[PDB]
Structure 1
Amino acid sequence: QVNRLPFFTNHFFDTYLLISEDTPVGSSVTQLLARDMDNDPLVFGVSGEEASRFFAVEPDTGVVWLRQPLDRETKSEFTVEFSVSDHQGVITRKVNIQVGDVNDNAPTFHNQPYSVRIPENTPVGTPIFIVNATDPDLGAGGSVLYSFQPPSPFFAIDSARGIVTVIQELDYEVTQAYQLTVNATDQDKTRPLSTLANLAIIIT
């Protein structure tokens, strides 16, 4: 009987652990599993400065809890070193942690305020202005579409490119200025987020 050392048995050590960035602080993200053939009392730990800022471990149960919010937009992959000890040996093993994205950002407009002077004789179909908004979520969640709320019979906006065109003959005498509201939305399937911006069009 030399001491048998314990070993982790979590399947994730072979692959990776996926954790959603909306996991709340204090939630349990997994439970460490280890075996010691002596059946020695085991003590679980986390090691690393980076890792111990984000996770804590219950020492007897091996429940791993989140210490502070994950943010997929800041950091989407961590390497975490976990430890298990029988008080004669500290065994360590690394897991790759993958942060899952949620749609948690609305689009942000750039180059505001938006304002453009055009002559009353601007032909139909003429491009007059380009709005721009960006959105750092993954995938459909980060893909911006533009529209006018509500649509205008005098101006259209290209949904993908944010280019404003004249679609109706203008008339200074009828209308001197339009205040349009541009909606930029992401395309998240179930929880789209959008944001509004003002576009002033001044007729000459």
Structure 2
Amino acid sequence: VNRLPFFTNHFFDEYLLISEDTPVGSSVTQLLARDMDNDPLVFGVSGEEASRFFAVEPDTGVVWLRQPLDRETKSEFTVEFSVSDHQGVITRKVNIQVGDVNDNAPTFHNQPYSVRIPENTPVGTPIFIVNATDPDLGAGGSVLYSFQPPSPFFAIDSARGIVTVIQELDYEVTLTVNATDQDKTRPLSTLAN
């Protein structure tokens, strides 16, 4: 009787997390197996789609990233890896969970942003609503509005993007919105006029 090999990595039992900003051609992990006969062991990848994304070194089973990951496209996928002792091939699927980075700046909608109001428009009048979205996860996808630089006449609610008159106007006397996400380390911001 030949004793068929088995994979020993923790991630078959739980999952493998790979950050979306991992450089192409980097080594995500190395497959680990055991053969009771201490036969030589050969490591591969199974699947049309999987094959493109990942490469596996057959003597050791170092796994390499072949294609750019984007959490905002596909956050996770199943990949089947194989080990063979040359009697038989043994295949096991790992769950792979693309980790999010804050790789996206916010995006304003309705770019023709303009409105005209009477000189007499009283203090506290809401005059306009700006909308921007950010598709990164958590704080990286949560947008705050501010004027750049601040206005004595006009204020914008940081949460809702509502612009209201704070100073009395006078026709005979008389804007850059900055939308930013709230990522801790690498916040990304965008401007509209």
For the criterion TM > 0.5, the same-fold answer is yes
Kindly state the Cα deviation for residue 125 of structure 1 after the two structures are TM-superposed: 0.5
Deviation at 1:138, TM superposition (A): 0.4
Distance 1:56 1:39 in 2: 24
Q: Which 4+ runs in 1 deviate beyond 2 A? A: none
The percentage of counterpart residues that share the same residue type is: 99
1:15-66 CA-partner distances (Å, limit 9, x unpaired) = 0011111111010000000011111111100101121121110111100010
What is the rounded CA distance, in whole Å, between the counterparts of 1:59 and 1:174 in structure 2? 76
The structural deviation recorded for 1:132 is 0.6
Any idea what the Cα deviations from partners look like across 1:125-165, whole Å, max 9, x if unmatched? Answer: 01100111000000000000000001100000000000100
Corresponding residue SS for 1:140 = helix
Asked if 1:192 corresponds to 2:191, the answer is: no
Q: 3-state SS of the aligned residue for 2:64?
A: strand
TM-score (structure 1 length as normaliser): 0.93
- SS of residue in 1 equivalent to 2:170: coil
Cα distance, 1:88 vs. partner?
Answer: 1.5
Structure 2: runs of 5 or more not aligned:
none
Cα distance, 1:174 vs. partner? 0.8
In structure 2, the residue corresponding to 1:51 is in which secondary structure?
helix
TM-score (norm 2): 0.98
Figure out how many residues of one structure are paired with residues of the other and give that number: 193
TM-superposed CA distance for 1:4, in Å, is: 1.2
- Shift of residue 91, structure 1, vs aligned partner: 0.1
Residues 94-140 of structure 1 show CA distances to partners (whole Å, capped at 9, x for unaligned) of: 11111110010000100012100111010110110011100000000
3-state SS of 1:116 partner: coil
**Alignment root-mean-square deviation, CA:** 0.7
Q: Report how far residue 196 of structure 1 moved.
A: 0.5
Query: Following the alignment from structure 2 to structure 1, what is the Cα–Cα distance between the partners of residues 123 and 139?
Result: 32
